[PDB]
Design a protein around this ligand. Structure first.
Ligand SMILES: NC(=O)c1ccc[n+]([C@@H]2O[C@H](COP(=O)([O-])OP(=O)(O)OC[C@H]3O[C@@H](n4cnc5c(N)ncnc54)[C@H](O)[C@@H]3O)[C@@H](O)[C@H]2O)c1
Ligand SMILES: NC(=O)c1ccc[n+]([C@@H]2O[C@H](COP(=O)([O-])OP(=O)(O)OC[C@H]3O[C@@H](n4cnc5c(N)ncnc54)[C@H](O)[C@@H]3O)[C@@H](O)[C@H]2O)c1
Lengths: 321, 321
């Protein structure tokens, strides 16, 4: 009954599952919403139509066959100037966040909101993105940038409204924690890495230096405390010679320390009854300590891109409803 | 900056902590909200004022000294007819739900919304309460009726919007589970009960027959599936002669079974790695399996009335923001 129009940038693990979800949601939902797609782009294609056939785009991407499509081809900038409501950024994260910054600037100025799974602009240029949003009276949500499909920003925004002090501890970076836990099994780094490569588990540098965790901690700290931090404002460390205990994890923590928001990702030996120790190697989870709503433990069972796309979709519904 | 006016019915473990929270929230919040209280009632007092002094009401209730107050005394019905926005029901749960039904009817017809921690009207007269709300274009929220201060209805309503099949399993009834676990320690019923009484842990009939769980399951199932069930539509059981295993809990489950919403509270021996087995005796928690947002585990560490009042307060903010 209410139609919301989208331009989707990126058709990979997240983007392609988002298309599948949008299709099912359109057919099934009890929210009175319909999401129409007017534009899809990947690294090779940039297709516009008043009513993109989503099933066709899915089927042709699955067959490696978007080459075969009839649609208008227009550049990202032209697409932002066409009539629609929301941009979805499911593209690769740049090293410096500049491309994401420029893209959100142009999106906002063209009068559209942003939902992003890409953390790069937010981790490097948060106050600039927020200024461009405010300036243009637009909004951005970023559920999927931290803790994938486990509700986190919607949880903070709608479930614990009365709490003022919130403090966060979590496993939000899985690959480095996989490596730590395997090394704690008394395996050699080279053997863990070799197998992880064959399994598709891991250029693994950003993960294993703790930088992935650091980028997420910027977004989390800024959202929680209204800080305007970038990467240099947070602490992080990684694993790139020593042995690891069974109770060691790279834990990401944010809170107010000495009157100042603080964010850190550190390798710690946890107490044997710590909630975070209970999480499986594929499980994202966190403990959120609040002053009015107690201390809450939240996690999923198995992280994956379908659930991640489901977080993007929750943001899309929040913005629309 | 935006002022919302409340009438608070009940000044006990929940009600009195709600007053304390409202005071701190008014002083501290970054949401641009202020909650003003125009009316408070307990079993002895029914005080109205354009601007009730909350600190005074707290201090006089703590001293057992509301007798000493100057304010207008008016009946609940007169209070509902005065100008305000929301009624908070933090009163005792009736056996049959009729008093709660009549009270919400009069609240809605007088043009005010309801936030309730009392489960009784909802467990017995859900479709009637919902019809009276719809009829009068009013709203009711009930976060605190099931799983206390652990976000549950706000979680469903704002964090997993895209998911259609949701299925729920949880420990939502703590006292019966306390008794089960103590009995699993090879103690005698009479000794558990005697100690529990001295400790203030437990007329314990509704808890130990599983009826408390059953009432909560009605509310949960109706919220999840849009059913209009009452107590006779759900299954439940209790402990009121045999021995109990270490892995037995009274688990409350809801889901679609054979195309029909189903809700059951049953004593089950859980598999040793079940999430629900990880919860402490003071911990409410649940696992929510969804088709678009994965399977989510959520719990608190220690249930209590302050956190429960914090759930009431989250409902108040949702209704107002
Ligand atoms: N579960 C996850 O995979 C997960 C979880 C959280 C966040 N993310 C983030 O979501 C984003 C997408 O991840 P993914 O796994 O889908 O990546 P992917 O590599 O599977 O897909 C990237 C997609 O973007 C496309 N693309 C590349 N350059 C483009 C351009 N200039 N314009 C439009 N499209 C372009 C690619 O062709 C591909 O379709 C990343 O920034 C990632 O960090 C992913
Ligand atoms: N943490 C918890 O204690 C908890 C958790 C979930 C739900 N609840 C529910 O919240 C409600 C309140 O629980 P509580 O622990 O605060 O109970 P309580 O017994 O501590 O307080 C009940 C309050 O209601 C007052 N009251 C009694 N009759 C009244 C009337 N006719 N009008 C106005 N006030 C009246 C009492 O004097 C008292 O102030 C109950 O329905 C309970 O089932 C409580």
């Amino acid at each position: 009954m209410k139609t919301i129009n989208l331009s989707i940038f990126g058709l990979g693990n997240v983007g392609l599952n988002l298309l599948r979800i949008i299709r099912s949601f359109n057919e099934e939902n009890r929210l009175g919403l319909k999401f129409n797609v007017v534009f899809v782009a990947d690294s090779l294609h940039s297709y516009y139509n008043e009513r993109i056939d989503i099933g066709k785009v899915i089927s042709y991407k699955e067959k490696g066959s978007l080459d075969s499509l009839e649609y208008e081809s227009i550049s990202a900038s032209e697409a932002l100037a066409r009539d629609f409501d929301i941009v979805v950024d499911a593209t690769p994260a740049s090293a410096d966040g500049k491309k994401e910054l420029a893209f959100y600037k142009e999106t906002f100025e063209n009068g559209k909101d942003v939902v992003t799974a890409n953390k790069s602009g937010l981790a490097n240029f948060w106050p600039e993105i927020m200024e461009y949003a405010r300036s243009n009276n637009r909004r951005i949500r970023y559920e999927a940038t931290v803790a994938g499909g486990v509700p986190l920003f919607s949880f903070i925004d709608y479930s614990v409204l009365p709490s003022r002090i919130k403090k966060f501890r979590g496993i939000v970076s899985l690959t480095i924690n996989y490596f730590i836990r395997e090394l704690a099994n008394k395996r050699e780094f080279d053997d863990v890495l070799s197998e992880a490569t064959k399994l598709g588990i891991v250029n693994y540098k950003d993960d294993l230096t703790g930088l992935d965790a650091a980028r997420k901690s910027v977004i989390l700290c800024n959202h929680l405390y209204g800080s305007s931090y970038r990467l240099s404002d947070v602490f992080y460390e990684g694993i790139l010679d020593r042995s690891f205990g069974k109770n060691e994890r790279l834990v990401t923590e944010t809170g107010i320390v000495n009157g100042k928001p603080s964010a850190e990702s550190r390798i710690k030996s946890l107490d044997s009854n710590d909630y975070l120790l209970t999480l499986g190697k594929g499980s994202l989870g966190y403990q959120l300590q609040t002053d009015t709503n107690g201390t809450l433990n939240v996690s999923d069972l198995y992280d994956g891109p379908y659930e991640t796309a489901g977080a993007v979709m929750n943001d899309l519904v929040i913005l629309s409803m």
